[PDB]
Design a protein around this ligand. Sequence first.
Ligand code: A1BAR
Ligand code: CL
Length: 167
Amino acid sequence: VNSFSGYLKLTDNVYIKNADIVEEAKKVKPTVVVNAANVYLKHGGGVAGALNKATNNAMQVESDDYIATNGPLKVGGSCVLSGHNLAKHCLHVVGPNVNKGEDIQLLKSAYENFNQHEVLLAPLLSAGIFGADPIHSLRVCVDTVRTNVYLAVFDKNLYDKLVSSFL
Ligand SMILES: C[C@H]1CC[C@H](CO)N(c2ncnc3[nH]ccc23)C1
Ligand SMILES: [Cl-]
């Protein structure tokens, strides 16, 4: 039993809600919140920009040190950093950005990172400003993640479409 509330159950392990991931994280304080990261951990907009803003830029400061030490992530890769005031940990996961011409096939690799964590709060990878089809992203998620994932979808109109179109 966990404290996630108001989610629709899609499968044995995948749950979904129309919610603001920042406000969700602040309420639940999950062990792991997933960030929709880029390889440079530059958290300028989208989910990443909002999460970083909620940490008062502490996420960006920590991320800049991580990149200075380790270099960029891979598309499809991830790193675990602090969750600051939002969660114990933040799993920064890089889904392909279609608006950069990145291979959408890497979306499955991106979701595989979730399997290293028993429970996660997350957005749909490569959705929003990363320019992928969110219906496809949900399909890959459900078909890739085996651990317990609580998906937050910011747009109420998009949420209703994902549910009503979910197979
Ligand atoms: C991932 C991308 C697509 C699906 C979904 C729609 O709103 N979305 C978000 N969901 C929840 N919280 C959010 N904060 C900032 C953005 C955001 C953004
Ligand atoms: Cl977005």
